[PDB]
C-alpha cells in the first residue's frame, strides 16, 4: 500500500520500506515554459539527466536540547558538479526541486519533528541598524544554520558581525510558530514512520530570474516533542537530507563568475 | 565603523571648473539623499553652502552646484576664483539617528 | 448600451469613461474550491502517437 | 538675524565636571520647528557630533551611542538657554566646542515628522583645555 | 431643467461608496498576467486548516516553546480532570491568538460547527484509553467522569492510528453570536478525563506528551466587519 | 450562493471508523456532524458573501499627514515618498498574502487654521499638487521654473470645495507586486574591498514610484497661516495567490526586524474554565 515506495536515480541505491504518502504543493506538477509566456528570444539549453539527479548533503546530530535547522535553495546546490557549473555561466535560470528526509530509530525511542517549506523566507537581523546584514553570511552554503532560544543585541560597533538571530517560537520573523501549518508540511513521529517526501514547483512573480541574487524556496525544521530514551547517560541519532531538481534550463551565456567569499 | 572618504586636496587656476566627490559605505549614502555640505576658512566657523544635494540657500551663487545618488555625491564648481579656496566636508544622516562627517579636504593658500 | 441586474426590482448601470480603471466594481463571482492536497493526473502516452507533423 | 552666544568655563582639570551654556537671541527655545545640537572640533579628529534636544509638546533627548552614558543636556526656559554637562573629563576633551541650530529638510515621514540633515547657524567656538 | 435650484443632502465623503472617477494616465499599456499556484478567493478557505493551541500557558512556560506540550503519567486510576477549556474563540486567550481567532477578530458575528483533534507522541508499546466531553451551559461546571458522561462524549482507543477527532454541534438559541464574552451567548465547556490507567513495561520512559489542534467546518460563516484591538489608532 | 443542507441519520453499528486518521500526511479529514450523532432534517439559508476579498478591502484608510506654511520669507513646500509601509492598519492586512494585483484610488483632504488674527485677515487660498515620475528634476524653490508641468499631471483644489478623487491602473514592471524579496540588488565580486557590491538586504528596484510635491499659489499675506493635507487610499479589482500567517509583534523598520514587545501571552491555570 502507501507504506512502500520507490525513488532512485543515477547509479546509487538505498533501502526504504516505511514511507507515508507523498505531498504536492498546491497540486501542481512542474513543466517547461510555454511559447505564449516567454520573454527572452534566444534558444535555451536543457541538460536533462546531466543535472536532474539526487545529491546528498552533510549529516547532523539530533540532541536533547537541539533547537532547529534551516537551509536556503538553490544556494545549497551551487557546488554540486554540472548544475553548479551551469548556474554560474548562464545569467538566467529556472528549476523545480524535490526533497526527501531520512531518519530511523528503534521502538523504545519517542519523539517528533516537523517539516515546513516556505517561499520568500526572510529573517531578522541582530543590530539596531535596519537591514544591515551582509551577503556572505546570508548565503553560507550547504551547512545551513540553527535557531536560537533568545534575542540578544551586539555591542561591537567597530567590527559588527552583521548576522542573523532567528528565534524558534517567533519562526525568525515575528510570527507564531503554531500558525505555520498553513504551509506545505509533513510530520515525523518515531512510532509510525521514518521518512518524509515533498514536491516543489517553481514559484515567483516572473517566468525566470537571476539565480545568484534571489532565492525562491526556503526550508525549516523544528522539533515539537523532545527526544527521550531509557538511557540515562546520553543519546544521539543522525539526520541526512537529499535534494534533486527537475526541469532545468538557462539563458544568457557569457564569461564565468567568481563571487567574493570570506 | 563606516566612514566617508574624500580626496586629499585639489587646486587649480581661476576661470576653470572643479569637481569633488565624497564616497562611503552603502549604509551611509545609499539609502536616500540625506546629504549636505559645509565650508570653513582659517579662523572662521564652518558655513553652510548646500543642503539636500542640490538646494542652494539664499545668498549662494549659482556657480556651486553638484548632485548624484547611490554610493557617491559630487560637487561641481564653475567660474573658479581665488576666494573659492576653502575647506570642504561632506555629511550624512543615517536611519540610526546619527550624523557622520568625512575626513575633510584641505585647500589653503597663504 | 445600458445593463440591468437585480438588487439582490432591478437597477441600472452606465459607464461614461472609456477606460477600465475608471469603471466601478461588481460582485459577480462565487467560485471556490479548497482541495489542495494531491492529484493523480500525470501520465500521457506521447510516443504512441499515430500522427506526425 | 537670530544669533547665538557661548558661555562657560574654558579650563578643566582631569576627573572634574564640565558644563557649558549657549544663549539664544531673537528666537524662542520652545520653538516647535527648530532643534539644537552640540559639536566639537579638534585638529587630530576633525568634526564630530555629540547630541541634541528639542521640544514637541514635550521634552525629548537624543545622544550619541559612543558617549551616551557620559553626557547630559538640560534646557532653561527662563534664560532661553540650554546647558551641557560632561563627566569623567580627560585630556582628549581638549578641543573647540560650538552650539548650533538645525532647520527642517523636506521629505517628511518615517517616524511621523520631518528630517533635520544639518545646521545653518554656528557660534564663535569656545575652547576647553585639560591640564595638570 | 435644474440650473440653479435646490438639491438634497450631498457633497459629503463616505469611505464605503462606489462611483466612477476619471483616469490620470490615458492610453496606458498594461502588462498581462500569468497563472500562479494558490489563487485565493474566499477567507473560509483558510479557516478549514488545523493549527496548534497553547494549552499550558503557565508562568514558567508562557512565551516559550514548552507551552505547546502536556505531560501524562502511568499512575493509578483517578477521576480528576486533566485540563479544561471554555468555548469562546474571540475572547479566550488560548484561542484568540490562533488563525481562526485572528480572522474572527476582524468580524463581529459568526455561527457554525467546530472540530477538535489530538495527537499522541508516546512510544509504540504504550497503551491506554481516554475520554473527551462537551457540556452545554446552564449548570455547574463538570469536574468528574460521572458528571461529564451524562452529556456528549466519545471514547478514544490508542492503537496503530494515533489521532482522533471530536465534533462540536451547532446548538444555540440565536442565529449568531457576539464574540465579546457575553453571558447571554455563552458556548459551553470542554474537558478531558482518564478512562483507564496507562500501561508501560520495563526499560521504557515513564512520561508521554500529547498535542492538540483546532479547525473550522464547512458551514461556518461571518457577516460583519470591524477593526482589531491588537494595535490602536491615535489622535 | 447557497450552502449545503443537513440530512438525517440514525444509529449505527460497525467498524467503519471515519473518526480515525493520520495527520502525518498533512491532510484534514472533512468530517460532518451527521457521521457521529443523530440529526434532524434542516435547511440552511446563510451565505458567505461578506467573506470575499473585494468586500474585505472595500474600505478607505488614512496613509499620510503633510504640513505646509504660507509666509513672505517656515517651510513653503514639502515632498513625500509614496509607500504603504508607514502605517500598520493596512500593512498588516496586506501582509496576509505574498503577491497581489489591483487597481488603486486616491482622495485628498485639506485643513487650515490661524496662528494669530492680531495682524489682520487674509483671503481664500488655493493649493497645488503635482506628480513626479522617477528621474524627473526636483523643484528647488516655491517659485521654480519646474512648476510649469508641461507633461507631469497636476491637480488644483479650492478651499471649501468637496474632496478630489483619482484612479490609476496597475503599473508594475513585473507580472505582479511583491511584498517580500529574499535577495540583493548586487553581487560582490573578487578584487573589491568595501565599496563595490555592498547593498542592503531586501532592497527593491533603483526607484519604486517617485514622490509628490505640494505648494500654495497665493502670494504671502502680512501674517502667517498653517495648513495640512491628508491622503486616503482604496483598492479595487483585487487578486492574490499565496497566504501567510499574520504579524504578532510591533513593527520596526520596513523589514521584519524586532527589538521589543516579546511577551504578548498572559498567565493562566491549566484546569480553569
Ligand atoms: C533589479 C531588482 C528587481 C526587483 C523586482 C521589481 C519589483 C520591486 C520594485 C517595486 C517596489 C515595490 C514596492 C511595494 C509595492 C506596492 O505594494 O505598492
Please name which of D11, D4, D12, D17 lies closest in space to residue D70, comparing C-alpha atoms. D17
Spatial distance between the Cα atoms of A237 and F62, rounded to a whole number of angstroms:
55
Spatial distance between the Cα atoms of B29 and B93, rounded to a whole number of angstroms:
8
CATH number of A1-262: 2.60.120.20
Tell me which residue has cell 566646542: D97
- Enter the C-alpha cell of residue D47: 568634526
E35: chain F residues, CB-CB within 8 Å: none
For Cα atoms B30, B36, B38, give the angle at the middle one, nearest 5 degrees: 140
Is residue B71 a part of any domain in this protein?
Answer: yes
Contact between chain E and chain C (3 or more Cβ pairs less than 8 Å apart): yes
Across the beta sheet with F126-132, the strand order is F78-81, F211-216, F126-132, F154-158
Pocket test for ligand 1, best of F205, F207, F231, F239 (most atoms within 8 A of CB): F205
Architecture of domain E52-198+205-222: Sandwich (2.60)
Count structural domains, chain B: 1
F202–A138 CB contact, under 8 Å: no
CATH number of C1-53: 4.10.80.10
Q: Where are the beta strands (DSSP E) in F31-160?
A: 61-70, 78-81, 99-114, 126-132, 154-158
Ligand 1 lined by F196 (C-beta under 6 Å): no
E205–A192 CB contact, under 8 Å: no
Could you tell me which residues of chain C have a Cβ less than 8 Å from any Cβ in chain E? 15-17, 19, 21-25, 29, 31-32, 34, 36
For Cα atoms D24, D21, D44, give the angle at the middle one, nearest 5 degrees: 110
Under 8 Å CB pairs connecting chains B and D tally to 51
Q: Is A118 helix (H, G, I), strand (E, B) or coil?
A: strand
Chain E: residue nearest C21 by CA?
A: E23
Chain C: residue nearest A23 by CA?
A: C38
For residue B85, the enclosing domain spans 18-101
B96–A128 CB contact, under 8 Å: yes
Cα E235 to chain centroid, rounded: 34
Q: Please compute, for residue B108, the number of CA atoms within 13 A of its CA located in the half-sphere on the CB side.
A: 10
Chain C: residue nearest A28 by CA?
A: C39
* Sign for the pseudo-dihedral over CA of F31, E51, F176, C20: positive
Distance D29 CA to ligand 1 centre (A): 43
Burial A94-119 (b: 16+ CB within 10 A, else e): bbbbbbbbbbebeebbbbbbbbbbbb
Q: Which residues pair with A253 in a beta bridge?
A: A90
Distance from CA of B95 to the nearest CA of A (A): 7
Hey, is the C-beta of A104 within 8 angstroms of any chain E C-beta?
A: no
Q: Which residues pair with A114 in a beta bridge?
A: A187, A222
- Return the residue in B43, B101, B104, B106 with the most chain D beta carbons within 10 A, the one to mutate for interface testing: B101
**Domain residue ranges of chain A, discontinuous segments joined by +:** 1-262
> Is the CB of residue D6 less than 8 Å from the CB of residue D99?
yes
Dihedrals φ, ψ of A81, to 5°? 55, -135
Distance from CA of D107 to the nearest CA of B (A): 10
- Nearest residue, CB atoms, F194 vs list B25, B54, B55: B25
Q: Which residues pair with A187 in a beta bridge?
A: A114
Task: Report strand pairing: D126-130 vs B72-77.
Answer: unpaired
CATH for F179: 2.60.120.20
A129–B1 CB contact, under 8 Å: no
CA distances to E118, E137, F44 from E187, in Å: 21, 7, 21
A157–B95 CB contact, under 8 Å: no
Hey, is the C-beta of F138 within 8 angstroms of any chain B C-beta?
A: yes
Count structural domains, chain F: 1
Burial class (CB in 10 A: 0-12, 13-18, 19+), F19: middle
Q: What is the CA radius of gyration of chain C?
A: 23
Q: What is the dihedral of CA A173, A174, A178, A182, to 10 degrees?
A: -50
Q: Is F249 helix (H, G, I), strand (E, B) or coil?
A: coil
User: Chains meeting C at 3+ CB pairs closer than 8 A?
Assistant: A, E, F
Instruction: Tell me the structure's resolution in angstroms, rounded to a single decimal.
Output: 3.7
Spatial distance between the Cα atoms of D52 and D116, rounded to a whole number of angstroms:
11
Chain C: residue nearest E218 by CA?
A: C34
Instruction: Name residues whose C-beta falls within 8 Å of residue E82's C-beta, 6 or more positions apart in sequence.
Output: E70, E72, E192, E193, E194, F271
Greatest Cα pair distance in chain F: 95
Show me where chain C is broken: residue before each gap, C-N > 2.5 A. Answer: 8
* Domain D3-124 grouped into CATH 1.20.120.790: no
* Sign for the pseudo-dihedral over CA of F203, F205, F209, F212: positive
Spatial distance between the Cα atoms of F224 and E48, rounded to a whole number of angstroms:
60
Show me where chain F is broken: residue before each gap, C-N > 2.5 A. Answer: 73
* F24 secondary structure, DSSP code: G
F58: chain E residues, CB-CB within 8 Å: 16
F103–C21 CB contact, under 8 Å: yes
Q: Is F23 helix (H, G, I), strand (E, B) or coil?
A: helix
- Return the residue in A67, A228, A232, A235 with the most chain E beta carbons within 10 A, the one to mutate for interface testing: A228
Peptide bond between residue E132 and the one before it cis (omega within 30 degrees of 0): no
Nearest-CA residue for ligand 1 atom 10 is: F208
Tell me which residue has cell 474600505: F59
Hey, is the C-beta of C33 within 8 angstroms of any chain A C-beta?
A: no
Contact between chain E and chain B (3 or more Cβ pairs less than 8 Å apart): no
CA distances to A153, E145, F75 from E196, in Å: 51, 12, 79
Greatest Cα pair distance in chain B: 42
Residue F97 CB: number of other CB atoms within 10 A?
Answer: 19
**Domain residue ranges of chain E, discontinuous segments joined by +:** 52-198+205-222
C38: chain F residues, CB-CB within 8 Å: 27
B56: chain F residues, CB-CB within 8 Å: 140
Hey, is the C-beta of A158 within 8 angstroms of any chain B C-beta?
A: yes
- Kind and range of the H or E element at F55? helix F53-56
Nearest-CA residue for ligand 1 atom 9 is: F205
For D77-112, give the DSSP string: TTTTEEEEEE-S--GGG-EEEEEEEE---S---SSS
C37–A29 CB contact, under 8 Å: no
* Sign for the pseudo-dihedral over CA of E60, E65, E67, E71: negative
> Is the CB of residue F215 less than 8 Å from the CB of residue F75?
no
Hey, is the C-beta of A218 within 8 angstroms of any chain E C-beta?
A: no
Ligand 1 atom nearest the C-alpha of F83 is 18
Spatial distance between the Cα atoms of F78 and F67, rounded to a whole number of angstroms:
8
C39–A21 CB contact, under 8 Å: no
**Domain residue ranges of chain C, discontinuous segments joined by +:** 1-53
CA distances to A62, A171, A214, F229 from A142, in Å: 17, 20, 16, 52
Nearest-CA residue for ligand 1 atom 4 is: F205
Distance F206 CA to ligand 1 centre (A): 9
Question: Across chain C, how many H-helices and E-strands are there?
Answer: 0, 2
Show me where chain E is broken: residue before each gap, C-N > 2.5 A. Answer: none
- Nearest residue, CB atoms, F81 vs list D103, D107, D114: D107
From which experimental method does this structure derive?
Answer: cryo-EM
> Is the CB of residue E176 less than 8 Å from the CB of residue E111?
yes
- Enter the C-alpha cell of residue F134: 522617477
Tell me which residue has cell 520500506: A17
Instruction: Name residues whose C-beta falls within 8 Å of residue F212's C-beta, 6 or more positions apart in sequence.
Output: F79, F80, F82, F129, F130, F131, F132
The length of chain E in residues reads: 235
Spatial distance between the Cα atoms of A208 and F240, rounded to a whole number of angstroms:
20
Residues 36-65 of E with CB under 8 A from C: 38, 41-42, 44-45, 48
3-state SS of chain E is CCCCCCCCCCCCCCCCCCCCCCECCCCCCCCCCCCCCCCCCCCHHHHCCCCECCCCCCCCCCCCHHHHCEEEECCCCCCCCCEEEECCCCCCHHHHCCHHHHHHCCECCEECCEEEEEEECCCCCCEEEEEEEEECCCCCCCCCHHHHCCCEEEEEECCCCCEEEEEECCCCCCCCECCCCCHHHCCCEEEEEEEEEEECCCCCCCEEEEEEEEEECCCCEECCECCCCCCCCCC
F189–A259 CB contact, under 8 Å: yes
Chain F: residue nearest C24 by CA?
A: F236
Residues 95-154 of A with CB under 8 A from B: 128-130, 132
- Nearest residue, CB atoms, D106 vs list F64, F65, F75: F75
Pocket test for ligand 1, best of F177, F180, F255 (most atoms within 8 A of CB): F177
Chain A: residue nearest B3 by CA?
A: A158
Q: Where are the alpha helices (DSSP H) in chain B?
A: 26-29
Amino acid at each position: 500500500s502507501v507504506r512502500v515506495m520507490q525513488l532512485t536515480l543515477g547509479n546509487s541505491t538505498i533501502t526504504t520500506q516505511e514511507a507515508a504518502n507523498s505531498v504536492v504543493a498546491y497540486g501542481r506538477w512542474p513543466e517547461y515554459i510555454k511559447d505564449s509566456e516567454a520573454n527572452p528570444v534566444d534558444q535555451p539549453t536543457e541538460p536533462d539527466v546531466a543535472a536532474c539527479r539526487f545529491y546528498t548533503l552533510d549529516t547532523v546530530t539530533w540532541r536533547k536540547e537541539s533547537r532547529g535547522w534551516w537551509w536556503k535553495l538553490p544556494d545549497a546546490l551551487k557546488d554540486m558538479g554540472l548544475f553548479g557549473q551551469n548556474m554560474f555561466y548562464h545569467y538566467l535560470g529556472r528549476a523545480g526541486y524535490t526533497v526527501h528526509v531520512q531518519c530511523n530509530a528503534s521502538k523504545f525511542h519517542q519523539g517528533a519533528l516537523g517539516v515546513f517549506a516556505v517561499p520568500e523566507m526572510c529573517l531578522a537581523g541582530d543590530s539596531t541598524t535596519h537591514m544591515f546584514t551582509k551577503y556572505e553570511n546570508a548565503n553560507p552554503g550547504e551547512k545551513g544554520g540553527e535557531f536560537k532560544g533568545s534575542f540578544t543585541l551586539d555591542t561591537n560597533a567597530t567590527n559588527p558581525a552583521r548576522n542573523f538571530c532567528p528565534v524558534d517560537y517567533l519562526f525568525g520573523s515575528g510570527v507564531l510558530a503554531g500558525n505555520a501549518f498553513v504551509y506545505p508540511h509533513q510530520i515525523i513521529n518515531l512510532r509510525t514512520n521514518n521518512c518524509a517526501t515533498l514536491v516543489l514547483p517553481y514559484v515567483n512573480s516572473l517566468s525566470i530570474d537571476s539565480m545568484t541574487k534571489h532565492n525562491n524556496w526556503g526550508i525549516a525544521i523544528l522539533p515539537l516533542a523532545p527526544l527521550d530514551f531509557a538511557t540515562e547517560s546520553s543519546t544521539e541519532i543522525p539526520i541526512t537530507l537529499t535534494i534533486a531538481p527537475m526541469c532545468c534550463e538557462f539563458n544568457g551565456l557569457r564569461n564565468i563568475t567568481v563571487p567574493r567569499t570570506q | 565603523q563606516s566612514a566617508l572618504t574624500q580626496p586629499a586636496s585639489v587646486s587649480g587656476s581661476p576661470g576653470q571648473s572643479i569637481t569633488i566627490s565624497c564616497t562611503g559605505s552603502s549604509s551611509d549614502i545609499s539609502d536616500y539623499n540625506y546629504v549636505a555640505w559645509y565650508q570653513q576658512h582659517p579662523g572662521k566657523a564652518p558655513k553652510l553652502i548646500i543642503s539636500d544635494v542640490s538646494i542652494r540657500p539664499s545668498g549662494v551663487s549659482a556657480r556651486f552646484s553638484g548632485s548624484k545618488s547611490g554610493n557617491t555625491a559630487s560637487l561641481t564648481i564653475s567660474g573658479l576664483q581665488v576666494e573659492d579656496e576653502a575647506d570642504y566636508y561632506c555629511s550624512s544622516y543615517t536611519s540610526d539617528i546619527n550624523i557622520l562627517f568625512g575626513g575633510g579636504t584641505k585647500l589653503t593658500v597663504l | 448600451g445600458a445593463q440591468v441586474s437585480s438588487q439582490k426590482i432591478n437597477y441600472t448601470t452606465i459607464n461614461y469613461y472609456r477606460d477600465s480603471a475608471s469603471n466601478a466594481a461588481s460582485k459577480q463571482d462565487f467560485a471556490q474550491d479548497p482541495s489542495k492536497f494531491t492529484e493523480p493526473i500525470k501520465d500521457v502516452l506521447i510516443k504512441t502517437a499515430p500522427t506526425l507533423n | 538675524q537670530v544669533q547665538l552666544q557661548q558661555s562657560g568655563p574654558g579650563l578643566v582639570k582631569p576627573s572634574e565636571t564640565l558644563s557649558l551654556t549657549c544663549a539664544i537671541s531673537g528666537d524662542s527655545v520652545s520653538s516647535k520647528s527648530a532643534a539644537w545640537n552640540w559639536i566639537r572640533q579638534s585638529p587630530s579628529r576633525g568634526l564630530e557630533w555629540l547630541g541634541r534636544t528639542y521640544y514637541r509638546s514635550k521634552w525629548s533627548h537624543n545622544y550619541a551611542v559612543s558617549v551616551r552614558s557620559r553626557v547630559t543636556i538640560n534646557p532653561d526656559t527662563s534664560k532661553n538657554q540650554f546647558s551641557l554637562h560632561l563627566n569623567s573629563v580627560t585630556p582628549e576633551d581638549t578641543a573647540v566646542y560650538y552650539c548650533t541650530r538645525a532647520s527642517p529638510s523636506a521629505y517628511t515621514h518615517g517616524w511621523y515628522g520631518s528630517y533635520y540633515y544639518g545646521m545653518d547657524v554656528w557660534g564663535q567656538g569656545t575652547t576647553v583645555t585639560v591640564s595638570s | 431643467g435644474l440650473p440653479v435650484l435646490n438639491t438634497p443632502g450631498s457633497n459629503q465623503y463616505l469611505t464605503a461608496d462606489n462611483y466612477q472617477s476619471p483616469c490620470a494616465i490615458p492610453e496606458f499599456d498594461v502588462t498581462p498576467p500569468i497563472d500562479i499556484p494558490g489563487e485565493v478567493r474566499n477567507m473560509m478557505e483558510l479557516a478549514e486548516i488545523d493549527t496548534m493551541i497553547p494549552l499550558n500557558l503557565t508562568n514558567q512556560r508562557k512565551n516559550t516553546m514548552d507551552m505547546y506540550r502536556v505531560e501524562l503519567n502511568d499512575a493509578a486510576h483517578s477521576d480528576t480532570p486533566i485540563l479544561c477549556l471554555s468555548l469562546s474563540p474571540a475572547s479566550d486567550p488560548r484561542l484568540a491568538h490562533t488563525m481562526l481567532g485572528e480572522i474572527l477578530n476582524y468580524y463581529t458575528h459568526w455561527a457554525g460547527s467546530l472540530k477538535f483533534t489530538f495527537l499522541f507522541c508516546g512510544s509504540m508499546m504504550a497503551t491506554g484509553k481516554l475520554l473527551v466531553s462537551y457540556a452545554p451551559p446552564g449548570a455547574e461546571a463538570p469536574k468528574s467522569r460521572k458528571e461529564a458522561m451524562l452529556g456528549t462524549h466519545v471514547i478514544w482507543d490508542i492503537g496503530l492510528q494515533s489521532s482522533c477527532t471530536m465534533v462540536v454541534p451547532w446548538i444555540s438559541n440565536t442565529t449568531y453570536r457576539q464574540t465579546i464574552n457575553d453571558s447571554f451567548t455563552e458556548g459551553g465547556y470542554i474537558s478531558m478525563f482518564y478512562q483507564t490507567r496507562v500501561v508501560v513495561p520495563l526499560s521504557t520512559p515513564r512520561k508521554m506528551d500529547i498535542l492538540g489542534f483546532v479547525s473550522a467546518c464547512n458551514d461556518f460563516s461571518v457577516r460583519l466587519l470591524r477593526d482589531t484591538t491588537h494595535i490602536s489608532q491615535e489622535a | 450562493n447557497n450552502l449545503p443542507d443537513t440530512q438525517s441519520s440514525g444509529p449505527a453499528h460497525s467498524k467503519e471508523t471515519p473518526a480515525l486518521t493520520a495527520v502525518e500526511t498533512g491532510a484534514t479529514n472533512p468530517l460532518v456532524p451527521s457521521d457521529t450523532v443523530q440529526t434532524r432534517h434542516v435547511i440552511q439559508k446563510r451565505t458567505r458573501s461578506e467573506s470575499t476579498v473585494e468586500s474585505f478591502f472595500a474600505r478607505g484608510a488614512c496613509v499620510a499627514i503633510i504640513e505646509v506654511d504660507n509666509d513672505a520669507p517656515s517651510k513653503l513646500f514639502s515632498v513625500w515618498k509614496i509607500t504603504y509601509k508607514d502605517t500598520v492598519q493596512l500593512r498588516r492586512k496586506l501582509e496576509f498574502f505574498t503577491y497581489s494585483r489591483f487597481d488603486m484610488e486616491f482622495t485628498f483632504v485639506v485643513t487650515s487654521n490661524y496662528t494669530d488674527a492680531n495682524n489682520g485677515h487674509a483671503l481664500n487660498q488655493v493649493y497645488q499638487i503635482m506628480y513626479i515620475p522617477p528621474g524627473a528634476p526636483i523643484p528647488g524653490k516655491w517659485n521654480d521654473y519646474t512648476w510649469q508641468t508641461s507633461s507631469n499631471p497636476s491637480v488644483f483644489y479650492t478651499y471649501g470645495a468637496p474632496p478630489a478623487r483619482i484612479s490609476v491602473p496597475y503599473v508594475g514592471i513585473a507580472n505582479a507586486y511583491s511584498h517580500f524579496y529574499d535577495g540583493f540588488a548586487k553581487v560582490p565580486l573578487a578584487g573589491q574591498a568595501s565599496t563595490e557590491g555592498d547593498s542592503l538586504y531586501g532592497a527593491a528596484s533603483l526607484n519604486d514610484f517617485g514622490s509628490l510635491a505640494v505648494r500654495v499659489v497665493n502670494d504671502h499675506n502680512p501674517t502667517k497661516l498653517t495648513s495640512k493635507i491628508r491622503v486616503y487610499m482604496k483598492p479595487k479589482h483585487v487578486r492574490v495567490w499565496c497566504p501567510r500567517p499574520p504579524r504578532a509583534v510591533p513593527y520596526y523598520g520596513p523589514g521584519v526586524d524586532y527589538k521589543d514587545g516579546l511577551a504578548p501571552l498572559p498567565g493562566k491555570g491549566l484546569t480553569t474554565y
